[PDB]
Tab-separated table of C-alpha atoms in Angstrom:
chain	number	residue	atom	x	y	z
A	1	UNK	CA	0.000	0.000	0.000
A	2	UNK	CA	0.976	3.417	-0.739
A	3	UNK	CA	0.910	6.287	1.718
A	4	UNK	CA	0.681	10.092	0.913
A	5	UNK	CA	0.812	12.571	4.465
A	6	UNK	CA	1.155	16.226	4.154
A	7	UNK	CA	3.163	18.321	5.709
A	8	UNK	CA	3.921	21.571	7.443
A	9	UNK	CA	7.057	24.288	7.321
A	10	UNK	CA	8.362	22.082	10.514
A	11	UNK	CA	8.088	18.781	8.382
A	12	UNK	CA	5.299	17.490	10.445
A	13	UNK	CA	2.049	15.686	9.428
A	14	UNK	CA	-1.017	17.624	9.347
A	15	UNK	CA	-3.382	14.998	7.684
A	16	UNK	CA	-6.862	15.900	9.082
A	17	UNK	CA	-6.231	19.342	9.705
A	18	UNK	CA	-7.424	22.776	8.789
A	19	UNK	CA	-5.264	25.419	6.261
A	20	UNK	CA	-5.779	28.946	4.554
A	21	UNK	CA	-7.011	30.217	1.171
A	22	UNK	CA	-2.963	31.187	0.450
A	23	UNK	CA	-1.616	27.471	1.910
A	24	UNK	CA	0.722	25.683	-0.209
A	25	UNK	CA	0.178	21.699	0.281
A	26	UNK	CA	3.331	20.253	0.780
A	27	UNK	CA	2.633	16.169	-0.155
A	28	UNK	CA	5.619	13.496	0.295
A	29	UNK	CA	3.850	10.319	-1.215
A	30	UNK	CA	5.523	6.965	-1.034
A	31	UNK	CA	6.222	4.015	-3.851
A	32	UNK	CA	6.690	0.972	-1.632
A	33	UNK	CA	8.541	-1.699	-3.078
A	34	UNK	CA	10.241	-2.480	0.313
A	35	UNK	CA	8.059	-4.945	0.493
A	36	UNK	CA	9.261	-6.838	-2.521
A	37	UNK	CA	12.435	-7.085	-0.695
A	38	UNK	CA	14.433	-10.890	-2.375
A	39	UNK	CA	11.674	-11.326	-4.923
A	40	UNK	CA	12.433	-13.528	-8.062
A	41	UNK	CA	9.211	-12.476	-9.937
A	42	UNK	CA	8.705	-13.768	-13.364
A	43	UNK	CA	9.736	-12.017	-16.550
A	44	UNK	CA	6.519	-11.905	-17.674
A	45	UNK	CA	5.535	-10.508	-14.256
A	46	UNK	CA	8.175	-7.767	-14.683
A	47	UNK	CA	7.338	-6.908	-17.796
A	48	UNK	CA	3.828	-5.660	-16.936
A	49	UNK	CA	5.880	-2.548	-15.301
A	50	UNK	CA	5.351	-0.118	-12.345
A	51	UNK	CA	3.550	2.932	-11.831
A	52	UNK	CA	2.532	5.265	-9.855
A	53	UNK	CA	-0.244	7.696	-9.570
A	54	UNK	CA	-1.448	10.533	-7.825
A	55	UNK	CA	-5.069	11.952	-7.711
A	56	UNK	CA	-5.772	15.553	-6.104
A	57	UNK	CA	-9.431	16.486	-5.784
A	58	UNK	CA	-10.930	20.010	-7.598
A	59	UNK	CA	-9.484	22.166	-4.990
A	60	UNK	CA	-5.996	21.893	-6.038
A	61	UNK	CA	-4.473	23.808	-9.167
A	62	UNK	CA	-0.649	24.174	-9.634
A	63	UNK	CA	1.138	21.163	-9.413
A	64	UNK	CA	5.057	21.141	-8.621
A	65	UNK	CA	7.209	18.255	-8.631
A	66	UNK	CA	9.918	18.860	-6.114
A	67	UNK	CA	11.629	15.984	-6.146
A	68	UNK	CA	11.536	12.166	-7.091
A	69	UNK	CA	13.826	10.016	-4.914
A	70	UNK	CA	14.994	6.576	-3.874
A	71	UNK	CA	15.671	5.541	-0.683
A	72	UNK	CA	19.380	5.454	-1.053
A	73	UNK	CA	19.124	9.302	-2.014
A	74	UNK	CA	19.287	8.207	-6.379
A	75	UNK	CA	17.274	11.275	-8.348
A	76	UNK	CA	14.981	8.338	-10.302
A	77	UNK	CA	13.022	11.392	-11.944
A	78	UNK	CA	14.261	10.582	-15.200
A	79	UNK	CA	13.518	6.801	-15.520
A	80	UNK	CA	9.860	7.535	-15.093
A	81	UNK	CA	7.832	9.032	-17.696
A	82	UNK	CA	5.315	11.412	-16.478
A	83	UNK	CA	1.356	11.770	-18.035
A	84	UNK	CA	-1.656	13.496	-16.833
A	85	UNK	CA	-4.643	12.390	-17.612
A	86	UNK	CA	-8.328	13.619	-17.908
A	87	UNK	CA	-11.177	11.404	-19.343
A	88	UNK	CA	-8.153	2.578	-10.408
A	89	UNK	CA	-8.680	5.787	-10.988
A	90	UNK	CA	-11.310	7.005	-13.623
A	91	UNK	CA	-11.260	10.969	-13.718
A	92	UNK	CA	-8.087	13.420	-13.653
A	93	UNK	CA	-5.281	12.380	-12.378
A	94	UNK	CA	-0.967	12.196	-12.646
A	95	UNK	CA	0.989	8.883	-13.289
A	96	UNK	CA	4.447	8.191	-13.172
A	97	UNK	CA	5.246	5.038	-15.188
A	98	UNK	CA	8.964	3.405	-14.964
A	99	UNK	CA	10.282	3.642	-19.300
A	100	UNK	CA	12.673	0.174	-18.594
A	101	UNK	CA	10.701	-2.176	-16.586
A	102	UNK	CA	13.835	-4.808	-16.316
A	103	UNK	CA	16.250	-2.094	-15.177
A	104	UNK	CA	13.520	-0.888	-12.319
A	105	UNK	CA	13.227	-3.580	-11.360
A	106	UNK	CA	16.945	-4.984	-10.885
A	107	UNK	CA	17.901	-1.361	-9.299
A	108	UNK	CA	14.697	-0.743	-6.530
A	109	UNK	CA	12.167	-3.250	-6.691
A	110	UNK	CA	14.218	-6.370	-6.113
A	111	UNK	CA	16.871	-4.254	-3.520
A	112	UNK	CA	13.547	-2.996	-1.620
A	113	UNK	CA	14.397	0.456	-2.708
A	114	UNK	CA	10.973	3.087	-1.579
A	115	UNK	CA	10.540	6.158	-3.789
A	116	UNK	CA	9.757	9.179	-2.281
A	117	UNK	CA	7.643	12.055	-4.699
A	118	UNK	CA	7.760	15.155	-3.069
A	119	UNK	CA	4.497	17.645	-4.907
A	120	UNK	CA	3.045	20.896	-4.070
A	121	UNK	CA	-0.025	22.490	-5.325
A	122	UNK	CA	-1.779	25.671	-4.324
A	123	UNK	CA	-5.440	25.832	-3.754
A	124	UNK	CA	-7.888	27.271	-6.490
A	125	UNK	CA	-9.047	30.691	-5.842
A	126	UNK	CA	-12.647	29.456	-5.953
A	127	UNK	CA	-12.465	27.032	-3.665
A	128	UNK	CA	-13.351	28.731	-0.654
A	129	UNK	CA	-14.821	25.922	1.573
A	130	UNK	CA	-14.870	22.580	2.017
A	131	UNK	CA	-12.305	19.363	2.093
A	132	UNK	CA	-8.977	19.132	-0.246
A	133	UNK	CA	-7.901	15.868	-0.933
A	134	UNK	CA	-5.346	13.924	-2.407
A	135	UNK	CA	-4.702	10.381	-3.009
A	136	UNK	CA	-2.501	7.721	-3.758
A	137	UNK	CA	-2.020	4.383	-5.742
A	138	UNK	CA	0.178	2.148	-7.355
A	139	UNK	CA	0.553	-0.544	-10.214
A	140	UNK	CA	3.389	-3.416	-9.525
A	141	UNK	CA	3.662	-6.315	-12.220
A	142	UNK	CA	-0.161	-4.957	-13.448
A	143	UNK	CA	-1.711	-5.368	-9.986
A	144	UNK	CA	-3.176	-1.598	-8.759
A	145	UNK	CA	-3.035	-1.279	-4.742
A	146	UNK	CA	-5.316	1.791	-3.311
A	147	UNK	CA	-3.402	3.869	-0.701
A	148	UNK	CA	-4.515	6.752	1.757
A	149	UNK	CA	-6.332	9.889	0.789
A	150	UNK	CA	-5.054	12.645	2.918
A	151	UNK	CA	-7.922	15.756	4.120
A	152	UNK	CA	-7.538	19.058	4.964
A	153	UNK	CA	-9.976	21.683	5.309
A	154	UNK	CA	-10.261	24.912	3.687
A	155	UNK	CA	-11.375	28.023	5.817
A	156	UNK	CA	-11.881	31.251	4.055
A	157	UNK	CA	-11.301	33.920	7.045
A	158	UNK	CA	-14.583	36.420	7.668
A	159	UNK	CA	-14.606	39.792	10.230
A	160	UNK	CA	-17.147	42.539	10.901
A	161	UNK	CA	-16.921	45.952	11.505
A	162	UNK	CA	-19.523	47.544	14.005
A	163	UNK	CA	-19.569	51.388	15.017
A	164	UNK	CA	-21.011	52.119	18.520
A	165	UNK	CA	-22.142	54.478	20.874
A	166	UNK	CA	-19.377	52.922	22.949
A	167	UNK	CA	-17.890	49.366	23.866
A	168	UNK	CA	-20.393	46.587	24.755
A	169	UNK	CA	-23.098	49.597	24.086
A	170	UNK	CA	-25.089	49.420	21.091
A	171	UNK	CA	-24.853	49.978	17.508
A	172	UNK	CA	-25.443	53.192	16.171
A	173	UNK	CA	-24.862	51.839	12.556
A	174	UNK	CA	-26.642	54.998	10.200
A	175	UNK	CA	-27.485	57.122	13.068
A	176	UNK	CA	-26.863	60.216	13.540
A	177	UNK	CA	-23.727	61.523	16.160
A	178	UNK	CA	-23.796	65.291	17.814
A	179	UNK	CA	-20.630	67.192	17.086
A	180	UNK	CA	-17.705	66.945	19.831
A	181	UNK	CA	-19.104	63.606	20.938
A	182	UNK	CA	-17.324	60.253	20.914
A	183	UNK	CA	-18.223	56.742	18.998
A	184	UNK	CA	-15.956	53.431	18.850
A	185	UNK	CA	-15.682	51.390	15.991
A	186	UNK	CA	-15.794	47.828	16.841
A	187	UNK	CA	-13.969	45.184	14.577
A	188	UNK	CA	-14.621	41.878	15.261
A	189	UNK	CA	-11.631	39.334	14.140
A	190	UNK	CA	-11.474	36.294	12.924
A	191	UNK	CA	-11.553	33.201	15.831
A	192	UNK	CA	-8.764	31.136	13.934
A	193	UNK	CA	-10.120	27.275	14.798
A	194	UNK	CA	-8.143	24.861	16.639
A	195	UNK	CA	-7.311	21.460	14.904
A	196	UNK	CA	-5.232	23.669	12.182
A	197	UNK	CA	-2.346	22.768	10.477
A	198	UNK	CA	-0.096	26.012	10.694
A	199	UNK	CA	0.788	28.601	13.302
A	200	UNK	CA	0.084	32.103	13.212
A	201	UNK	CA	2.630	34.593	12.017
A	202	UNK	CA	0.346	37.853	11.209
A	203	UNK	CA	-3.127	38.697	12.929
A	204	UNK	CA	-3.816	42.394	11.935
A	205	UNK	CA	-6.037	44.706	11.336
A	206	UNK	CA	-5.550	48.456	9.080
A	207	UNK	CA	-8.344	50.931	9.759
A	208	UNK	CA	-9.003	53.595	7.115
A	209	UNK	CA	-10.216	56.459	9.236
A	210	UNK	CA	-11.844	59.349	7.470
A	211	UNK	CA	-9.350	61.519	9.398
A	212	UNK	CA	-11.487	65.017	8.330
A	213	UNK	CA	-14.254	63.970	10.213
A	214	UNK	CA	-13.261	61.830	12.998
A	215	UNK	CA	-10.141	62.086	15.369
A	216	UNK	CA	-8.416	58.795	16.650
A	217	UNK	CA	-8.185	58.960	20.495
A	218	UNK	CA	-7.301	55.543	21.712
A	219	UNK	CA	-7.824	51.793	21.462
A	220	UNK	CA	-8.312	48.746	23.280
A	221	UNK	CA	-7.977	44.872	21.919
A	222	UNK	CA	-9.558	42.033	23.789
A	223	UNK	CA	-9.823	38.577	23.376
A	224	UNK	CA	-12.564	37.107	21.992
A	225	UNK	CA	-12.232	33.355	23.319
A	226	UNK	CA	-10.160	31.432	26.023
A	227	UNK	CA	-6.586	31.303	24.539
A	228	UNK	CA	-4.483	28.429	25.562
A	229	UNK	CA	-0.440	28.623	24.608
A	230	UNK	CA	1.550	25.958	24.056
A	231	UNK	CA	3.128	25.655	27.699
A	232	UNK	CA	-0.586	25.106	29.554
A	233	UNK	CA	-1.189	29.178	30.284
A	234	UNK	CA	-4.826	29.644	29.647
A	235	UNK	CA	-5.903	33.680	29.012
A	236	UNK	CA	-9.211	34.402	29.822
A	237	UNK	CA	-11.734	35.132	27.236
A	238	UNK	CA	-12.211	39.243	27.816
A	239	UNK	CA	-8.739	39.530	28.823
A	240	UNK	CA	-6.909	42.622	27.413
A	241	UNK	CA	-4.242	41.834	25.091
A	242	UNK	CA	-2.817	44.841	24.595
A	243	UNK	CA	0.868	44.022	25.661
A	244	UNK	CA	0.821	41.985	22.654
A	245	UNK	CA	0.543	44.404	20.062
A	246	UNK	CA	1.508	47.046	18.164
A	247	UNK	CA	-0.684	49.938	17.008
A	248	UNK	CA	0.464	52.613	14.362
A	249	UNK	CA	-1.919	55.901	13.013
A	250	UNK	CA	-0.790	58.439	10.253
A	251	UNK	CA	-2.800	61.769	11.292
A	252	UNK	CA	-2.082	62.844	7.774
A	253	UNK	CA	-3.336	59.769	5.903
A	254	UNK	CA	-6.150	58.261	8.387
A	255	UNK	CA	-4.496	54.916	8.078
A	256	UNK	CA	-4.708	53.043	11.738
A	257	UNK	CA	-3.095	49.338	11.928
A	258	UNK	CA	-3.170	47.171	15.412
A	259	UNK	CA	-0.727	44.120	15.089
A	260	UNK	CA	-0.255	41.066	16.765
A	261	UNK	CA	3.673	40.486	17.758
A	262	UNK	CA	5.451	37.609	15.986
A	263	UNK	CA	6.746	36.238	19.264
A	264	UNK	CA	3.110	35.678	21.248
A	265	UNK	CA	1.248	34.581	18.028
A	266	UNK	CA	4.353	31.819	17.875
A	267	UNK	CA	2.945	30.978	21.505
A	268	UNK	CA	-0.446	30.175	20.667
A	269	UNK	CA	-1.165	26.260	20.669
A	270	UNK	CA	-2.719	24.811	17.196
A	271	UNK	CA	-5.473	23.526	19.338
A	272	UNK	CA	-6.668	26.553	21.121
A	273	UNK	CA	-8.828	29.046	18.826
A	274	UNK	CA	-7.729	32.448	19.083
A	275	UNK	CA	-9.202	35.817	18.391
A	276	UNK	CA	-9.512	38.979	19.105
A	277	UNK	CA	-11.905	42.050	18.938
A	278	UNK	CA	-10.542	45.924	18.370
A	279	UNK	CA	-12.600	48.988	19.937
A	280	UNK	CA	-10.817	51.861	18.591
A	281	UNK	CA	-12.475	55.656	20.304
A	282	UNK	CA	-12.600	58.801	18.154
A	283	UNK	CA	-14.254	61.855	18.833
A	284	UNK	CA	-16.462	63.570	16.105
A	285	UNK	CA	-14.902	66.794	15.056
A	286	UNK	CA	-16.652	67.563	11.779
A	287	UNK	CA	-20.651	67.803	10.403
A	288	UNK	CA	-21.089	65.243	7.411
A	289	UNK	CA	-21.325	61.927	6.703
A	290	UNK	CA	-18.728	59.482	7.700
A	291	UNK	CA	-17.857	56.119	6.505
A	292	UNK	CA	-15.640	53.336	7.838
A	293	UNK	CA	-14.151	50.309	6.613
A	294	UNK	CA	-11.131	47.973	7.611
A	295	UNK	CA	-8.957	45.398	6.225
A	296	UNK	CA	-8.113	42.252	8.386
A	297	UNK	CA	-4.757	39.894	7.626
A	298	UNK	CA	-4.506	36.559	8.695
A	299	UNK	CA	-0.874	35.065	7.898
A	300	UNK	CA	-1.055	36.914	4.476
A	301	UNK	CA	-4.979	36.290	3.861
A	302	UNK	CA	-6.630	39.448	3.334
A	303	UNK	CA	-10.594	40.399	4.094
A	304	UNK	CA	-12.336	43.210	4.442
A	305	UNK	CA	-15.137	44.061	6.875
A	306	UNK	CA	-18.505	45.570	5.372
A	307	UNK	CA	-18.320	49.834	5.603
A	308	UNK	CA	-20.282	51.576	7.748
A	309	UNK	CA	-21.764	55.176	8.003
A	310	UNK	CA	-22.567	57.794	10.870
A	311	UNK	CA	-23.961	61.324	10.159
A	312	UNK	CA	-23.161	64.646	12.065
């Protein structure tokens, strides 16, 4: 039987687990002939050939072929010829077929000799929920052995943007906002899910703040579940988290951005969710009608929340 697992940046499995719009899969699949360790098969036998093929499901788009190994470290990539087809497998799929049977055979199958086909896709754009899959199976001497089919789900990031009369008040959302008062925008981030196959590196979010009308005052970020790091130390849902960021505003250009740190993100166990919610306080300095939006980034995934409007 052949096995496929799929790996992270660390070069650990993550079969079973969840990944982002931007992931690239990282497969090692595996050939086994260590199985046929001392066989004397038949030349007939042997002359029915070896192949191997891979089949990803519709999420996946750009294949690469990193490398095709033995074992003993031999590059076999040019003994095997490779085809894709599109019409045991009975759809689209990849095959890698050994050109001299007899010389295969003699050099890996009969020394128990494994190859090793390291392949990366990306995920299609348009594929923006559900389960990626890829399997595995392989032709010795004309019989075809099934392998694994490795799962990973796909979760497209979503965030909000509220505006309030102030935190854990109420939404003011097209209402109206007397001059010299004060009203905090609310942006609601995305609770990453536990069981995923990658740690965070980037949990931001970049405020365009119609700087004519409104003037930034202050902030405040708080979590938005129970956060467990990697070491047992539990934070309490409501805690604030503002030791763990960084916040940045251009009073010339409106642009506000509140950043997790590298470092504590790094911290964050793959089976805790994590999340956080951003109150940001400005005070109304100008009569009109003023809009808000933000952008939220999620280890290089970018969404945007929906705009909203408040009138002086």
């Amino acid at each position: 039987p052949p096995t496929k697992k799929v790996l992270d940046e660390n070069g650990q499995s993550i079969n079973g687990k969840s990944v982002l719009p931007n992931a690239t899969l990282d497969y090692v699949a595996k050939q086994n002939f260590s199985q046929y360790k001392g066989i004397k098969a038949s030349a007939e036998a042997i002359a029915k050939g070896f192949a191997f093929v891979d089949q990803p499901n519709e999420a996946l788009a750009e294949l690469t072929v990193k490398s095709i190994k033995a074992s003993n470290g031999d590059d076999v990539s040019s003994l095997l010829e490779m085809r894709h087809v599109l019409s045991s497998p009975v759809g689209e799929f990849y095959m890698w077929t050994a050109k001299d049977p007899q010389a295969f055979y003699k050099a890996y199958v009969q020394k128990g000799l494994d190859i090793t086909y390291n392949l990366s896709f990306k995920v299609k754009k348009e594929f923006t929920k559900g389960q990626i899959k890829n399997g595995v199976a392989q032709i010795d001497f004309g019989n075809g052995y099934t392998g694994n089919i490795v799962v990973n789900d796909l979760t497209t990031p979503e965030v909000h943007k509220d505006v309030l009369d102030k935190e854990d008040g109420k939404s003011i959302n097209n209402g109206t906002v007397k001059l010299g008062d004060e009203v905090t925008y609310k942006l609601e981030g995305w609770v990453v899910p536990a069981n995923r196959g990658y740690d965070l590196f980037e949990y931001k979010f970049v405020d365009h703040l119609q700087h004519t009308h409104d003037l930034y005052l202050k902030d405040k970020v708080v979590a938005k579940v129970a956060i467990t790091l990697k070491d047992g130390t539990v934070i309490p849902k409501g805690t604030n988290l503002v030791q763990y960021t960084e916040t940045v505003y251009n009073k010339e250009t409106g642009r506000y951005e509140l950043a997790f740190k590298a470092d504590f993100l790094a911290q964050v166990s793959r089976s805790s969710a994590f999340g956080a919610d951003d109150f940001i306080v400005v005070k109304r300095i100008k009569a009109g009608d003023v809009y808000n939006t933000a952008d939220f980034f999620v280890n290089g995934n970018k969404v945007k929340t929906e705009t909203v409007v408040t009138h002086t």
